[PDB]
Nucleic acid binder design. Structure first.
Length: 54
RNA sequence: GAAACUUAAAACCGUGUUGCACUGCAACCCGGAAUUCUUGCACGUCG
């Protein structure tokens, strides 16, 4: 329950650490900070794991 | 006084249901408690 009250916070902290720096490598893509999550197929290998190093 | 079987013959027998009437019967819950439950992205990879 205490985790669910800070759910938009951990969704933003996992956004800046997992795929904000990977998204900024490819040109023409503008980085958003967001409470961003990923859902469903076609989302990539990075969204369905917890591996850190490239 | 010594000498001559109150003897012989004759089933205590014949006939006759230990028989007649009578419910091993009346009353009684195989009943009371219990989640087919616990974990699991129809998804990953592109000369």
């Amino acid at each position: 329950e205490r985790f669910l009250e800070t759910l938009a916070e951990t969704a933003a902290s996992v956004n800046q650490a997992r795929y904000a720096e990977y998204r900024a490598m490819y040109p023409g893509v503008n980085a958003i900070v967001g409470p961003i999550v990923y859902l469903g197929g076609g989302a990539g290998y990075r969204s369905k794991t917890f591996v850190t190093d490239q």
